[PDB]
Structure 1
C-alpha cells in the first residue's frame, strides 16, 4: 500500500529543524512543495470515498515517482500534502513540481458509469532563503498555493515578495 509510506504531519517540525540546519551549515538549496487536490471534497461526495481514496493513491504514486529517496512526503488532511526537496535548485524544483502536476492531469479515471474523472493539482513552491524558522518557509509556500487555487487551479506558483 502506497499510502502507508506517507509521513504524518507531527514529524514536520523535527524533520524541518534538522533539514534547515543542514542547509545553512552547507549552503545547499532547499525547497518545499505544498500540494492540494483540486475540488477534492466535491469529488469525494459525487463519486465516493472509495473513489476519493483511489485518487489519493494515484496522486501519492506520482509523488514518489518524481522525488528522491532523500526527499520527504507528508500527508496531513484528506487531500493535503507537503513535499520537502532537499538539495534542489529553483530550476530543479519547478521542473519537479511540473512533472507532478502534469502527471495528475493526464491520469484519466474511469467512473462507475464509464465517464472520465477530472483530476488536477494546485502546487505552492518556495525556496529556502536562510531564515532559521521553518514555519516561515511553510507559510510562503502555502501562500503560493493560495494563489494557484485563486488563479484557477491546475497550476504551479512560486512565492515572491510581490502579491
Structure 2
C-alpha cells in the first residue's frame, strides 16, 4: 500500500497548504493579538485614527501611553522564550486591567511594546494611569536578574496628549510624542513614566 501512503501524503500536503493560506488571510482580518488577546497593531492604528477624528469633532483631550518592557531581551535569554511569552501575557493583563472605560483600548504595539489609547483623558489622568500600570507590573514581581540579580520585571512608559485641530498635528504625531517621552523614561533609569514636552 505504498502508493496509498504516498498519495495520502500528497493529499494532506495540499489540504495543509490551503489551510496555511486561509490562516494567513484570517489573521489580517482579526483585531486581536494571538499571544496576549489585546488589540494588535493594525487595529490600534485604525482605532487611534478613528478616535483622533472623534476628539477633533468634540475638541476633547486624546491621551496615549506607549509602554515598553524593560530589559526584555535578556529575560528571553536567561529565562527562555516560553517564560517570556507568559511574562508578556501578564504585562498585557496588567495593561488591560489598567484601563476601565468602554472607550479605553489596550494594544500590543510590537514585540515587547504596548500602547493604551485613552479618549477624553487629561494629561493628569493619563499620568495617573501610567503610574498605576507601571506599579501593577512591578507588583507582579516576576523574577529578573537585571540589572541587579534580585530584581523584578518593569516597564517604562511615555505619555502624550493632544486636542486635535492644531496645525500639522495628526494621530501620528501623538504617537511620536509618546515615543519621545518613552525615551526620556528609559534614559532616566527605566521603570518610570516620562512626560511629553509641552
Note the residue ranges of structure 2 that are not aligned, 5 or more in a row.
1-32
Is 1:146 matched with 2:179?
no
Is 1:18 matched with 2:50?
yes
- Helix, strand or coil at the partner of 2:136: helix
- Which of 136, 139, 148 lines up with 1:106 in the alignment? 139
- Identify which of structures 1 and 2 has the higher relative contact order when contacts are C-alpha pairs closer than 8 Å and 6+ apart: 1
| CA contact 2:66–2:116 (8 Å) conserved in 1 | yes
TM-score normalised to the size of structure 2? 0.73
| CA contact 1:28–1:87 (8 Å) conserved in 2 | yes
Note the residue ranges of structure 1 that are not aligned, 5 or more in a row.
none
Alpha-carbon shift at residue 153 of structure 1 (Å): 0.1
Which residue number corresponds to residue 127 of structure 1? 161
Equivalenced residues, count: 158
TM-score normalised to the size of structure 1? 0.87
Which residue number corresponds to residue 71 of structure 1? 104
Alpha-carbon shift at residue 57 of structure 1 (Å): 1.2
Q: Write the distance in 1 (CA, Å) between the matches of 2:93 and 2:35.
A: 9
Deviation string, structure 1 residues 87-135 (Cα, Å, up to 9, x no partner): 1112211111111001111212368xxx966211100000113245111
Could you say which structure has the larger radius of gyration? 2
Q: Write the distance in 1 (CA, Å) between the matches of 2:142 and 2:170.
A: 40
| CA contact 1:3–1:60 (8 Å) conserved in 2 | no
Q: Write the distance in 1 (CA, Å) between the matches of 2:129 and 2:34.
A: 20
Q: Write the distance in 2 (CA, Å) between the matches of 1:4 and 1:56.
A: 7
